[PDB]
Amino acid sequence: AGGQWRLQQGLAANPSGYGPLTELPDWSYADGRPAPPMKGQLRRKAERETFARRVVLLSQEMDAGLQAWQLRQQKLQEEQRKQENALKPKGASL
Amino acid sequence: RGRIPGRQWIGKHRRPRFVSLRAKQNMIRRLEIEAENHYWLSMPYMTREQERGHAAVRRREAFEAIKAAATSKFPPHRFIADQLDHLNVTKKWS
Amino acid sequence: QGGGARALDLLRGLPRVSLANLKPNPGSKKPERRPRGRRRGRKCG
Amino acid sequence: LTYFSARKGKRKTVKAVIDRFLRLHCGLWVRRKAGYKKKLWKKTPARKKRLREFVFCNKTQSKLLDKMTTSFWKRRNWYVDDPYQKYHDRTNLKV
Amino acid sequence: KVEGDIWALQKDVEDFLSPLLGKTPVTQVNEVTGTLRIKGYFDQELKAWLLEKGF
Amino acid sequence: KFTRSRIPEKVFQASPEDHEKYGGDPQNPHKLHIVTRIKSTRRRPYWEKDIIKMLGLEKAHTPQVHKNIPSVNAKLKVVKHLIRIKPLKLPQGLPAEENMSNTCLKSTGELVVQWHLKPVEQ
RNA sequence: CUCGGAGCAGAACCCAACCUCCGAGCAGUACAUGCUAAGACUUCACCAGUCAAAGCGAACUACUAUACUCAAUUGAUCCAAU
RNA sequence: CCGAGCCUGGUGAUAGCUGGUUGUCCAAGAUAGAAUCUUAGUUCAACUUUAAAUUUGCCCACAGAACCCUCUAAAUCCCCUU
RNA sequence: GAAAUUGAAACCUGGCGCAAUAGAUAUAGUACCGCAAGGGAAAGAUGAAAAAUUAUAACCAAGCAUAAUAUAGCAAGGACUAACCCCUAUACCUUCUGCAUAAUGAAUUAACUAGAAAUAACUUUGCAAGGAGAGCCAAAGCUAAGACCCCCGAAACCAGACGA
Ligand SMILES: [K+]
Ligand SMILES: [K+]
Ligand SMILES: [K+]
Ligand SMILES: [K+]
Ligand SMILES: [K+]
Ligand SMILES: [K+]
Ligand SMILES: [K+]
Ligand SMILES: [K+]
Ligand SMILES: [K+]
Ligand SMILES: [Mg+2]
Ligand SMILES: [Mg+2]
Ligand SMILES: [Mg+2]
Ligand SMILES: [Mg+2]
Ligand SMILES: [Mg+2]
Ligand SMILES: [Mg+2]
Ligand SMILES: [Mg+2]
Ligand SMILES: [Mg+2]
Ligand SMILES: [Mg+2]
Ligand SMILES: [Mg+2]
Ligand SMILES: [Mg+2]
Ligand SMILES: [Mg+2]
Ligand SMILES: [Mg+2]
Ligand SMILES: [Mg+2]
Ligand SMILES: [Mg+2]
Ligand SMILES: [Mg+2]
Ligand SMILES: [Mg+2]
Ligand SMILES: [Mg+2]
Ligand SMILES: [Mg+2]
Ligand SMILES: [Mg+2]
Ligand SMILES: [Mg+2]
Ligand SMILES: [Mg+2]
Ligand SMILES: [Mg+2]
Ligand SMILES: [Mg+2]
Ligand SMILES: [Mg+2]
Ligand SMILES: [Mg+2]
Ligand SMILES: [Mg+2]
Ligand SMILES: [Mg+2]
Ligand SMILES: [Mg+2]
Ligand SMILES: [Mg+2]
Ligand SMILES: [Mg+2]
């Protein structure tokens, strides 16, 4: 219930998804010492990090590939100019 | 008194099936999702010429790891300690 | 020289070798298959 | 096939295989093409030449003939002036 | 017929065969029987290598 | 006979009305996709099952990021009826080495590089 | 009841029915349709079947001349005749 | 209890046919055809399983694959990139 | 399916054999069945002492008795304060494209009753251009070990006996 409304607010459709209700620690020691991280949150933290690194890796490959294609186009243009020079024409035109 | 000849949902004479109000809404809901997928596939970031070769280095290195793991199969090492530790089954108190 | 000397002085601290603690070398005794149980029973292969 | 003979308790050799096939020590079997002596007048010379060839057998046929013959026929022979001596071993074979 | 520290032999074999193979060879060390098993045919190379070592 | 379907290229030509509806910018196409499988591969031909495995969409409702390139889009067009495609948004840019562990993908398609789990003070 | 062509099977291959049609169990011309040998095809296996450069030997400086024309035009092993 | 007695022996006759086939746990696993007195079965392929070797497999960009003919079909083959 | 040829060991009184549905059929070829040839069983259980018989306690299958039964349903499960009431659930094996199937087998208990091995290959030791305790194999082989191949059933055919 209310999955669509949560999406309209930028939240996860399932309340068990990302948010303070899930990711925050469930408990802590009475004296105030924080509890060790929950095993579920550790799995999500590692899974999110791999997704973040994959985003960077894909972005850098496309940026590098676009530069390589642009570099080839610049190189191709320069090659045409060099071949224009040759021996001076003679004959009827002199 | 009203019976469908043979099986209900197969054959020349079948039990009629009617589209409910929510059945239409579910199909329209999935149609809207696919319509938005058409839009996001209409704007590629790079052309086919620019895309070519931009990930060949990573793909080649990925397959070399597969080859390395495939050709690394071998029996595991055997240790003297493992064989000698079996004598402990008859260890007794003095 | 950790192959000969080490394999013998280690044996000194172990219980006496007798007929009650002898095992075959691993991989030299393949398990015997019999037509008993759900897996290897019924039509028995 | 007789897996255990009644008099010696040993596997027997099907002599029909011996009269038709030659086993090279490398594991290959050599045979002649069927019908290479039949109706040669109605066969083209290109076809007749293929019939005269000494061909090998595939894995299934070679494995089948190995089961039908005992270990005597798989031993290494040193016949003097053996025509098939050079074919008993493989050279430059990978995998 | 390898006696003593067979693991010392494996490191020497891996160092010797690395330039030829271009990679670390796949070897198995059998401490119980004193046997070193190496993937690939290197009998001629190892016989000369062991002969040079004085064995 | 039921065979593979050739989608006309006219289907993937966005009209100006479509841009206003979805908010995309044709002159600045999104770099990456956010592909999520919302339909089962069962009761679908085997070539659709294989492509789902190639895209890493084995588990439904698990977001996966793919590059917005013609080769990747070609696979998406085959299984476009089994997936939801959304553009990846970077309000604070690409994650850096310092904030790799503080990233989260919101339901709006935005990847936020800071995730404090605290209400906003504004 | 075996073999070949066409439709079904419209475009690589393949694909059935006591499905719809037409055929084959030869003939003719050569007498190098001599020998040998890379690489291939293959009737969904096998058996069988098919195409072949180079080379040897011929032919040849007129002969769409170099694995005849032709779609099928056919039968394994054992054995028998010599 | 005779389309040819009964008992014993050959005899544990043979049966492509029917029935049955005994502890626990996990894993991979549904497969074009060809031949056959053969279609209630087998053998070879195909598929599946295990072990092993080393290297591309799948998805696929252009370019490319027939005339004869009425459906100017959905598609396929080939195929780098990814 | 040979042969020439080859050529060894050989100290009865033992058992990783059975223990009353086993091991011989056997307490016995008896009882019983058949004109005959022939077929062919079942079972026993105290203790040192029965010239200790008021002895040797007890608990264990199916079947019953102590103690019939209360709406409703493969008879159970989730449960629940509560057996039932509520909710959920079409026995099993075999055989099949597919069985709650009104297809097969099964009243039930106890006991008995069904995967035997070469060819290579693999795995693990030994030795190594040699291996093997004459033979055999060998272009890393060879020797040794481990590991794969069921039960019941015809109508028949034949030989020799026994029967009007
Ligand atoms: K019907
Ligand atoms: K089974
Ligand atoms: K199974
Ligand atoms: K049959
Ligand atoms: K049954
Ligand atoms: K039956
Ligand atoms: K019924
Ligand atoms: K039925
Ligand atoms: K019946
Ligand atoms: Mg009905
Ligand atoms: Mg059972
Ligand atoms: Mg056609
Ligand atoms: Mg096909
Ligand atoms: Mg073929
Ligand atoms: Mg020529
Ligand atoms: Mg009578
Ligand atoms: Mg039988
Ligand atoms: Mg029969
Ligand atoms: Mg499984
Ligand atoms: Mg026949
Ligand atoms: Mg059949
Ligand atoms: Mg393909
Ligand atoms: Mg390719
Ligand atoms: Mg008895
Ligand atoms: Mg007696
Ligand atoms: Mg009782
Ligand atoms: Mg009820
Ligand atoms: Mg109910
Ligand atoms: Mg039926
Ligand atoms: Mg049912
Ligand atoms: Mg009933
Ligand atoms: Mg029944
Ligand atoms: Mg029946
Ligand atoms: Mg009964
Ligand atoms: Mg066995
Ligand atoms: Mg065996
Ligand atoms: Mg019976
Ligand atoms: Mg007879
Ligand atoms: Mg008689
Ligand atoms: Mg009378």
Structure tokens at E24: 């670390």
Distance (angstroms) between ligand 3 centre and the Cα of F45 equals 27
Which residues of chain B have a CB within 8 Å of the CB of E26?
A: 71-74
Which B-chain residues 51-90 have CB contacts (< 8 A) with chain C? 80-81, 83-84, 86-90
Strands in E1-55 per DSSP E: 27-30, 35-38
Chain I bases having any atom below 7 Å from a protein CB = 1-2, 94, 115-120, 122-126, 128, 136-140, 145-150
- The residue lying closest to nucleotide G36, measuring its CA against C1', is D49
CA D51/CA D36 separation, integer angstroms: 5
CA C17/CA B72 separation, integer angstroms: 37
CA F33/CA F14 separation, integer angstroms: 17
What's at A32, amino acid-wise?
G
Residue of D76, D93, D81, D63 lying closest to D24 (CA atoms): D76
What's at B10, amino acid-wise?
I
Residues in the 5 Å CB sphere of ion ligand 1: B 6, 11, 13
Cβ neighbours, 10 Å, residue B13: 10
CA D52/CA C40 separation, integer angstroms: 52
CA D50/CA D56 separation, integer angstroms: 13
| Nearest CB partner across the interface for B37, out of F13, F26, F83 | F83
Q: Which phi and psi (to 5°) does residue A43 adopt?
A: -65, -40
User: At E9, which helix (H) or strand (E)?
Assistant: helix E6-21
Q: Please answer whether residues F83 and F36 qualify as being in contact, where contact means their C-beta atoms are separated by less than 8 angstroms.
A: yes
Cβ neighbours, 10 Å, residue F49: 15
Residue in chain E nearest C26 by alpha carbon: E32
CA A54/CA A60 separation, integer angstroms: 10
DSSP A61-73: HHHHHHHHHHHHH
CA dihedral of residues A50, A54, A60, A65 (deg, nearest 10): 150
Residue of F97, F87, F106 lying closest to F29 (CA atoms): F87
Strands F83-87 and E27-30, bridge-based pairing: unpaired
CA atoms within 13 A on the CB side of B25: 3
| Shortest-distance nucleotide from E43 CA to C1' | I140
Mutation pick from B26, B33, B45 vs chain F, by most beta carbons of F within 10 Å, is B45
Domain locations in chain A?
2-86
To the nearest whole angstrom, how far is the Cα of B73 from the nearest Cα of chain C? 17
Task: Tell me how far CA of residue B41 lies from CA of B24, E15, F14, in angstroms.
Answer: 26, 53, 9
DSSP D26-75: TS-EEEE-TTTTS-GGGS-HHHHHHHTSEEE--HHHHHHHHHTS-GGGGS
CA D4/CA D31 separation, integer angstroms: 28
**Distance of D64 CA from G79 C1′ (whole Å):** 26
Buried b (16+ CB within 10 A) or exposed e, A26-58: eeeeeeeeeeeeeeeeeebbeebeebbeebeeb
CA B78/CA E13 separation, integer angstroms: 18
DSSP F13-27: ---HHHHHHH---TT
Say which residues have a Cβ less than 8 Å from residue F7's Cβ, sequence separation at least 6: F77
Which residues of chain F have a CB within 8 Å of the CB of B40?
A: 22, 24, 30, 33, 85-87
Instruction: Assess whether chains F and D touch, using the rule of 3 or more C-beta pairs within 8 angstroms.
Output: no
| Shortest-distance nucleotide from D64 CA to C1' | I119
- The residue lying closest to nucleotide I123, measuring its CA against C1', is C27
Residue D36 beta carbon within 7 A of nucleic strand G: yes
To the nearest whole angstrom, how far is the Cα of C6 from the nearest Cα of chain B? 10
Q: Alpha helices, DSSP H only, in C1-45?
A: 4-12, 37-40
Mutation pick from B67, B71, B73, B78 vs chain E, by most beta carbons of E within 10 Å, is B78
Strands D29-32 and D54-56, bridge-based pairing: antiparallel
Q: Please answer whether residues A52 and F111 qualify as being in contact, where contact means their C-beta atoms are separated by less than 8 angstroms.
A: yes
Domain locations in chain F?
1-117
Buried b (16+ CB within 10 A) or exposed e, D12-42: ebeeebeeebebbeeeebeeeeeeeeeeeee
CA F63/CA F86 separation, integer angstroms: 10
CA E53/CA F32 separation, integer angstroms: 60
CA atoms within 13 A on the CB side of D20: 12
Cβ neighbours, 10 Å, residue D70: 13
Experimental method: cryo-EM
Q: Which residues pair with F34 in a beta bridge?
A: F65, F86
Which residues of chain A have a CB within 8 Å of the CB of B50?
A: 65-66, 69
C6-9, Cβ contacts within 8 angstroms, sequence gap of 24 or more? C6/B80, C7/B80, C7/B84, C7/E31
Contact E34 C3 (CB under 8 A): yes
Residue of F67, A65, A77 lying closest to B50 (CA atoms): A65
Residue in chain C nearest E6 by alpha carbon: C3
Cβ neighbours, 10 Å, residue F34: 22
